[PDB]
Write an enzyme that holds these catalytic residues in place. Sequence first.
Site, PDB file in Angstrom:
ATOM      1  CG  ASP A 181     -10.192  17.423  36.704  1.00 21.51           C
ATOM      2  OD1 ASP A 181      -9.083  17.436  36.128  1.00 21.51           O
ATOM      3  OD2 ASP A 181     -10.312  17.505  37.937  1.00 21.51           O
TER       4      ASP A 181
ATOM      5  CG  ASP B 207      -4.822  18.308  36.455  1.00 21.16           C
ATOM      6  OD1 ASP B 207      -6.015  18.003  36.253  1.00 21.16           O
ATOM      7  OD2 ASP B 207      -4.432  18.852  37.503  1.00 21.16           O
TER       8      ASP B 207
HETATM    9  C1  LIG Z   1      -8.942  17.660  41.224  1.00 21.23           C
HETATM   10  N1  LIG Z   1      -7.510  17.814  40.962  1.00 21.23           N
HETATM   11  C2  LIG Z   1      -6.570  17.830  41.948  1.00 21.23           C
HETATM   12  O1  LIG Z   1      -6.795  17.694  43.137  1.00 21.23           O
HETATM   13  C3  LIG Z   1      -5.192  18.004  41.268  1.00 21.23           C
HETATM   14  C4  LIG Z   1      -4.476  19.313  41.646  1.00 21.23           C
HETATM   15  C5  LIG Z   1      -3.703  19.972  40.693  1.00 21.23           C
HETATM   16  C6  LIG Z   1      -3.064  21.147  41.069  1.00 21.23           C
HETATM   17  N2  LIG Z   1      -3.142  21.682  42.308  1.00 21.23           N
HETATM   18  C7  LIG Z   1      -3.903  21.009  43.205  1.00 21.23           C
HETATM   19  C8  LIG Z   1      -4.582  19.829  42.927  1.00 21.23           C
HETATM   20  C9  LIG Z   1      -4.318  16.780  41.558  1.00 21.23           C
HETATM   21  C10 LIG Z   1      -3.087  16.880  42.215  1.00 21.23           C
HETATM   22  C11 LIG Z   1      -2.359  15.710  42.465  1.00 21.23           C
HETATM   23  C12 LIG Z   1      -2.856  14.465  42.053  1.00 21.23           C
HETATM   24  C13 LIG Z   1      -4.087  14.384  41.399  1.00 21.23           C
HETATM   25  C14 LIG Z   1      -4.664  13.131  40.945  1.00 21.23           C
HETATM   26  C15 LIG Z   1      -5.035  12.998  39.604  1.00 21.23           C
HETATM   27  C16 LIG Z   1      -5.594  11.793  39.165  1.00 21.23           C
HETATM   28  F1  LIG Z   1      -5.963  11.653  37.888  1.00 21.23           F
HETATM   29  C17 LIG Z   1      -5.788  10.729  40.055  1.00 21.23           C
HETATM   30  C18 LIG Z   1      -5.416  10.868  41.391  1.00 21.23           C
HETATM   31  C19 LIG Z   1      -4.857  12.069  41.835  1.00 21.23           C
HETATM   32  F2  LIG Z   1      -4.505  12.179  43.129  1.00 21.23           F
HETATM   33  C20 LIG Z   1      -4.804  15.545  41.154  1.00 21.23           C
HETATM   34  N3  LIG Z   1      -5.588  18.002  39.827  1.00 21.23           N
HETATM   35  C21 LIG Z   1      -6.884  17.973  39.766  1.00 21.23           C
HETATM   36  N4  LIG Z   1      -7.597  18.066  38.608  1.00 21.23           N
END
Ligand SMILES: CN1C(=O)[C@@](c2ccncc2)(c2cccc(-c3cc(F)ccc3F)c2)N=C1N
Length: 369
Positions: free
Chosen positions: A224, A35
């Site tokens: 991202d 991530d």
């Molecule tokens: C935008 N963003 C998020 O919202 C978070 C995050 C990270 C840390 N704290 C809060 C939020 C996250 C968290 C969980 C899952 C996903 C996820 C990733 C995928 F590629 C596809 C589908 C998904 F759901 C993403 N990472 C990112 N960049």
Amino acid sequence: SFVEMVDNLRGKSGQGYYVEMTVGSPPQTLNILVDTGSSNFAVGAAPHPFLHRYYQRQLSSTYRDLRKGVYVPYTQGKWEGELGTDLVSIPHGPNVTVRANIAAITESDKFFINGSNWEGILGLAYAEIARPDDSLEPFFDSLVKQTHVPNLFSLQLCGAEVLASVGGSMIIGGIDHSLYTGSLWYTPIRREWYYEVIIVRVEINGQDLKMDCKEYNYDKSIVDSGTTNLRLPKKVFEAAVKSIKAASSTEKFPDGFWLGEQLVCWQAGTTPWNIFPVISLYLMGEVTNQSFRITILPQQYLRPVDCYKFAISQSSTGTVMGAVIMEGFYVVFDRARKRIGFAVSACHVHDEFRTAAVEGPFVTDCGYN
Ligand SMILES: CN1C(=O)[C@@](c2ccncc2)(c2cccc(-c3cc(F)ccc3F)c2)N=C1N
């Protein structure tokens, strides 16, 4: 050597890419979302309905408690945990082990995904956006400080009754020339928090959206891997959808499709890719009035679910260049030189009339926040 890091990423379409890691002693195997849009190494560490395994601190002889909690509410959901450190390795990565901060997630809401096959997240962005604050050193910072691994990593995300499986490579500490063709073009990292960049122009089938470039980066643009879609500020989204609708007018779709909620289907190999236009994002170059463009095909922004979902959607927090963008390319996160490089990926999906492209220079402030 980088050959052993090739294909070290796996995933399900729309559910992110993960790399295998081990945490603790003896090593506990977990799949961890790669991530670039966050900065915490945060791993499930208690039972959860969508987790089939989790990090058990009590089983690790090398676990150290930091005696500090962390609470991270965010728009779509939230996670909460307890801070500590432990030994961490990436089996198909650099042959090193580092002591890293770990947020052991004890409670969460809509954070983990049913069937995704990952148990935590490797936030590869910078300390500024780390929780609870910037004193909690991110994993990659610890790795570079503790080992001789060069301050750089690169991502080749390849994409594709069951969600399609995707693959890719995370090369840590360098650039694998076999993973791309042609030249690498670099855009500056505007500020070290997210991987923030500047987009200076946007074209749909060669046609300029003709907006003040500030709009493209309102209030920021980031790269991202933890976002599936290409997400665009409201005004840019509308302008983009208008143009895409017009170019594909021959066929007609429900506005539920354009709203990225509804899927549309043709049957096995009839998909009319040629009816959908290419999209070019011009990124600020290393030279003031110089830019380059990355061009993606419908094969990237219509993601398989025969059936597809429109993977361009509206954002209220700026432009997000997610998997939809990255899957066309080999992306170099050159932290040591504060820049992100783009080159045509050896694995990017395309046809015999079009191909994804990285091209420059084009001559051309656009920074917003
Ligand atoms: C935008 N963003 C998020 O919202 C978070 C995050 C990270 C840390 N704290 C809060 C939020 C996250 C968290 C969980 C899952 C996903 C996820 C990733 C995928 F590629 C596809 C589908 C998904 F759901 C993403 N990472 C990112 N960049």
